[PDB]
Amino acid sequence: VYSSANNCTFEYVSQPFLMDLEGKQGNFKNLREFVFKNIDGYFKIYSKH
Amino acid sequence: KRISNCVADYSVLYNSASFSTFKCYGVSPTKLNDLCFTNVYADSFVIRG
Numbered sequence: 384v385y386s387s388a389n390n391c392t393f394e395y396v397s398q399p400f401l402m403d404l405e406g407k408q409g410n411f412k413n414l415r416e417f418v419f420k421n422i423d424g425y426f427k428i429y430s431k432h
Numbered sequence: 433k434r435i436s437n438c439v440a441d442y443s444v445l446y447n448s449a450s451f452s453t454f455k456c457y458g459v460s461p462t463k464l465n466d467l468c469f470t471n472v473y474a475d476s477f478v479i480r481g
């Protein structure tokens with residue numbers, strides 16, 4: 384995902400998320416929507432499965 | 433080391449007496465629980481007495 388890093392300013396872990404790494408070719412069963420927003424430096428997330 | 437996005441607790445810092453130096457330049461340590469900052473940085477090194 385990247386080569387290297389020098390210094391950082393922020394990080395976060397939150398609760399663990401469990402997901403399936405097996406890929407198939409069947410029809411879809413879930414829909415996920417995400418909204419990314421920035422006013423005054425505020426990074427906003429809006430999501431609901 | 434950068435310390436951020438956390439609620440500070442200097443109570444245990446001055447309620448201990450094992451330290452030898454508690455000089456706070458610029459800002460007065462008598463009011464630290466009333467002050468909200470953006471960033472906290474903490475260096476660490478060993479030096480002779």
Ligand SMILES: *[C@@H]1O[C@H](CO)[C@@H](O)[C@H](O)[C@H]1NC(C)=O
Pocket residue numbers: 389390391392
């Ligand atoms: C990280 O290092 C760079 C030097 O390339 C400096 O310009 C930047 O201000 C540093 N970031 C922080 C948060 O100190």
